[PDB]
Symmetry: D2
Subunit: 121 residues, 4 copies
């Protein structure tokens, strides 16, 4: 729990997540996607339970990335919600929502949902 | 635009969102929830598109709140993904995911999904 | 109750849902969508709790529509999960998932999520 | 595509799905869950694209199960939306929504979301 979130993680698509977990609940770092209208690293910010468990539970966390950087602006943002489980093979299991900015006419089809599993391998 | 988003907003459950949109695309503030094992204000952090399209398209954004403060700890975190629509009646329409920490065993039932609409209060 | 659900309903996008709830918990009917690459009516099938609680709790149900009929094929399917609330103004509040067939390559972007509220029409 | 959906599939939790895909788009069968306030088989009904692809795409499908049978009534329903991909190792990749019947007071927390991958192994 805690500390252990800090590091570089990769998900099944090959995207890389580099985070620092702060003693009080903050999550800061950068994200580089392997898919999308993404190009380079994007800033990410989130929050986690700094006091999880003590039944063998995971540590709830979440973070956001607005897909805009010095190279591209996809006019979308993705949020990942999930939990961290440490151990010999630590992982972060997440479900994400990706919203694109649309006109009201296309608001019904603005959000994609998926799931990503990140490991340090 | 940072401004448009900066302000106090409320949603249909009676919760309060106080946010400041920074020039760099950052979102920081506090959230007061009307439901759940929540008590007092919680810190929120998010990101938004500081350069949206010039299209009556909404401005994409998202933020997270881990439900732990100095008074309560619910061992859960919520992320909201949506867009801000400005105008006379500005709104932030979102869909959210609430994940609870659980044992591997109950992980299948760790996440709730819903939707919230926030209305800005200002004269 | 089967009845309560049986009828014609419309949602905020202007789509039409005609359903019959059978005694065994079955749902069958047709759906007319106001959006997407849809044209005409599509067949729908679902299930609902034919023995709900006796609690002003809603009646859980869900249904699917694959968007293929004799006129169009969008190579996608939508499932709606929600509950029916009866009363003077009966409503079915749902959250839906729309999955498109894609290549493994674009599977990450195969599913959309949203929410729909249906209002029953009847005098 | 088509036909190939018919059979017995299992997901990572150990739940079993037995379906018959009908020439015109219907999906019928039974489901036995490994988790929840479930007990025995429950009836399931759905729809699939009977005419998918011709770029190597999967076959979109979805189905519902109301968790009520002769033994238990959990007052909930689950819908799975996803696509079938056949081949040497066929699978059905899905995301699901589980709604429980609640009073309006708890409507905000009525729906769970997850993902399941089913194989014939
Ligand atoms: Cl990614
Ligand atoms: Cl992306
Ligand atoms: Cl809230
Ligand atoms: Cl519709
Ligand atoms: Cl299952
Ligand atoms: Cl279940
Ligand atoms: Na809330
Ligand atoms: Na629709």
């Amino acid at each position: 729990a805690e500390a252990g979130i800090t590091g570089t993680w990769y998900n099944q698509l090959g995207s890389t997540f580099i985070v620092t977990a702060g003693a009080d609940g903050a999550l800061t770092g950068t994200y580089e996607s392997a898919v999308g209208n993404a190009e380079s690293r994007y800033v990410l910010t989130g929050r986690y339970d700094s006091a999880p468990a003590t039944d063998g539970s995971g540590t709830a966390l979440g973070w956001t990335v607005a897909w805009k950087n010095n190279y591209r602006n996809a006019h979308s943002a993705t949020t990942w919600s999930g939990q961290y489980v440490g151990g010999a093979e630590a992982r972060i299991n997440t479900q994400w929502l990706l919203t694109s900015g649309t006109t009201e006419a296309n608001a019904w089809k603005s959000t994609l949902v998926g799931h990503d599993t990140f490991t340090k391998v």
